Design a protein around this ligand. Structure first.
Ligand SMILES: Cc1cc2nc3c(=O)[nH]c(=O)nc-3n(C[C@H](O)[C@H](O)[C@H](O)COP(=O)(O)O)c2cc1C
Ligand SMILES: Cc1cc2nc3c(=O)[nH]c(=O)nc-3n(C[C@H](O)[C@H](O)[C@H](O)COP(=O)(O)O)c2cc1C
Ligand code: NA
Lengths: 166, 150
């Protein structure tokens, strides 16, 4: 049994249009606990055109150091990171991904950054934009690193035990 | 930096489930969710909107993150907490809630913004660390006893 309302639902009107009229989305995204950023295309680069204060606190870098350049500067030259190829493929082909990179704050310290990215085509101006949600996942990556070394060491002991038996 | 029309487009299209709530007495009803949140929970926009997001607990209420969420939001802070949630089809997942509070001077209302993601594989992968360390000790001791017999 059910009591559903029998209305048609349209996709012609952008979802959450009341948030536009009340400027509510700008307010709450500026307040988010996660780093949130928006980029546009410019040749071989994807310069940032929006970042929120959580992203500045995350990176320690200032807004003018961040805005209007490609996010790759956070790699601080650590350009030999494997996740980069997966990120390029998503952003060039369209779609969504969640990928972890090493990044460096303004004060030199490092951290594990998890990039949750997607592309969105804008019918108005015919441009593709990109949106990213970022956060420090250092503790979670260290745990995953711990499982991997624990299994490599479990197999050494197991194999040495199996050999001494046989 | 960007206008509100573009902001709405990109938040609507985010990879992450993003919701906005408003203060309404003892509740914080949801006033916006994006399609990624519909995909994460299996509920539709009409099923989700205007109720408090606690329905995703399906009455699973002895969860320690609940006290932390309440204390944070009631004092206007931000938090990152994990709890058991249930999709529309009843399947369980660990949901990580990244929440923050903001007062709107224009309308004198308090709003909340949340980002949600599935961390089931990560919580279950973390639980392996302790299990592996205990098994590694057990096989090492079997080798130490066998090598003494040689
Ligand atoms: C929306 C968006 C956010 C991004 N955020 C980060 C980030 O926080 N840290 C990082 O190292 N790279 C980030 N990137 C990736 C770089 O901007 C760049 O795309 C990446 O380094 C691969 O591009 P490239 O190899 O051509 O330089 C982001 C990319 C996009 C589109
Ligand atoms: C913006 C926002 C998003 C939330 N998202 C979730 C969620 O995805 N899952 C969940 O179990 N609770 C979520 N909650 C928590 C509940 O709405 C509620 O605050 C929580 O259960 C503790 O309050 P209560 O004791 O009144 O239930 C969210 C809360 C806010 C403010
Ligand atoms: Na989250």
């Amino acid at each position: 049994s059910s009591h559903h309302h029998h209305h048609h639902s349209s996709g012609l009107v952008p979802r959450g249009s009341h948030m536009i009229n009340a400027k509510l989305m700008q307010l709450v995204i500026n307040a988010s606990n996660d780093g949130i950023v928006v980029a546009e295309r410019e040749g071989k680069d994807k310069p940032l055109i929006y970042v929120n204060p959580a992203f500045e606190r995350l990176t320690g870098y200032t807004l003018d150091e961040i805005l209007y350049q490609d996010c790759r500067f956070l790699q601080s030259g650590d350009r030999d990171q494997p996740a980069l190829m997966a990120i390029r493929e998503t952003l060039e082909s369209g779609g969504a991904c969640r990928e972890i990179l090493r990044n460096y704050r303004k004060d030199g310290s490092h951290f594990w950054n998890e990039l949750s990215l997607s592309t969105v085509y804008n019918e108005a101006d015919k441009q593709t934009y990109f949106v990213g949600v970022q956060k420090d996942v250092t503790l979670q990556v260290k745990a995953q690193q711990r499982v991997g070394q624990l299994e490599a060491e479990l197999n050494q002991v197991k194999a040495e035990l199996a050999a001494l038996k046989a």
